Swiss-Prot record, chain A:
Subunit annotation: Component of the U4/U6-U5 tri-snRNP complex composed of the U4, U6 and U5 snRNAs and at least PRP3, PRP4, PRP6, PRP8, PRP18, PRP31, PRP38, SNU13, SNU23, SNU66, SNU114, SPP381, SMB1, SMD1, SMD2, SMD3, SMX2, SMX3, LSM2, LSM3, LSM4, LSM5, LSM6, LSM7, LSM8, BRR2 and DIB1.
Top-level taxon in the UniProt lineage: Eukaryota
Protein known as: Pre-mRNA-splicing factor 8
Localization per record: Nucleus
UniProtKB/Swiss-Prot annotation, chain B:
Subcellular localization, as worded in the UniProt entry: Cytoplasm; Nucleus
Keywords: Cytoplasm, mRNA processing, mRNA splicing, Nucleus, Phosphoprotein
Native species: Saccharomyces cerevisiae (strain ATCC 204508 / S288c) (Baker's yeast)
Top-level division of the source organism's lineage: Eukaryota
Protein name: A1 cistron-splicing factor AAR2
GO terms of biological process kind: spliceosomal snRNP assembly; spliceosomal tri-snRNP complex assembly
Chain positions found as Phosphothreonine: T257
Annotated Pfam families: AAR2 (PF05282), AAR2_1st (PF20981)
Transmembrane segments: none
Amino acid sequence: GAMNSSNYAELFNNDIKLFVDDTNVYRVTVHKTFEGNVATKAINGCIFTLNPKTGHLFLKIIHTSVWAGQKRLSQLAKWKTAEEVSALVRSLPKEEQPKQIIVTRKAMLDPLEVHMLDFPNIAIRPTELRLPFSAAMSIDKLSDVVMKATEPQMVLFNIYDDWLDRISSYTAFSRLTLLLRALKTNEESAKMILLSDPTITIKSYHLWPSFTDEQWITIESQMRDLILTEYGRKYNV
Amino acid sequence: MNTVPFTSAPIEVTIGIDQYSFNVKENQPFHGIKDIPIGHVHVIHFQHADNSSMRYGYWFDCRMGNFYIQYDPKDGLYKMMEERDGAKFENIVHNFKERQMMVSYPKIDEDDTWYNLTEFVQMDKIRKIVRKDENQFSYVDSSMTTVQENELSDPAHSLNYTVINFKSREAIRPGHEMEDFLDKSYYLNTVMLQGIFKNSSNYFGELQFAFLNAMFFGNYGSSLQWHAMIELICSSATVPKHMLDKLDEILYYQIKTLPEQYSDILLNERVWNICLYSSFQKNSLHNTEKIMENKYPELL
């Protein structure tokens, strides 16, 4: 059933699993027409499919051409997400196929279940966790490859860079969710915190800066302060 | 007009005959039911005064043989049996009628209720859902499970309804996932109507039989089957026009007949709300929507 705080450690066991987030698949800008009506213009999106144990990110880029002449796009987006995840599982060798897929939003359960009827042994699960994966498009290099795409494209990342050389996947996932939570609550503050000191750079093959163990603690502390402040602001407490 | 004689009534029991019911006291001189209309299936059903649990009964068609009821003190129930000796049977029935120890099937001449509930139901199809091939009549009770229920245990005592599952390879064509799941026309028209049932009459027959097993025995799996077969039609954008018109008539009589006090457990809120207000066919069931809104506005 549903993934929550009581079964949190399951994410880091040796059963292959993927999180699927569909929140950046269908993206629009709302604007005024010449006649003063409102219209949307779609922009490129992405499916965020993450192995929380290894850090392997399967970033399927959703080019605006997939929406051309389609109706009910918010509904089609959930089915296109399910079709692309199904295609990804079928492309993987059997020993690499996930035993579970966890969807961050409940509206993905039926579309993914129907697309995965050929895989009756793969469990499709919701979660009660409020995961910040929507903030993935605040990672500069992921945003850059989505916005530059001219056609459908799958790009492979390790969202933990080289952290697993030094920390567990439990700790790497906690750092990732803290960074994305910060980016989601106050993108500018979060991004200022990460890049303020120009002596710390992002390697060409990495997404995040090359922080020492000591500098990650300081960073993690700044991100926690940003999140609590904004929460005091939001809820006048 | 046909007769189902009773050897005796040794235990106190509420006897149902189609939509009617009568109380019989322990050892009351009752010898059965006469003037049963020929041309329809019938169900005769029982609820013991001493154990209101296990409603049970027999689907039968008087054209298919001479049937009587006899209490079995070992198995503790009223059993249907066939008398193959036609002349012996007429003699027994004639005696009980002369002595007026039979109740009369109480059909009002204006009343098409039973015809309307059983229009498409055929004894030959009932005998395929309820497998007990040495008898021409079919036993049903409250606790019998469906083939689909047993998948999710005794196969001999199961209700063999047609398995319907909206999230099944049977229901979803490869590469038409979203289309076949949001519009079930393919599953209704090609898989079920053309493939399995062969025509709408057989589909309506199973739908009507599932309803009657739900209402008369409170058979939970029969209720599930009745709702599934409604939802498959309401969730199809493309349904023959005659099927929609006939479905509205079928459901109207089922809702008309349902005991007021059972609507809370026998009617699935999600299915009815979806069928009358959300579905492709939300505008196609005028009679059914009017009776549901006037008789059970709470469920909606």
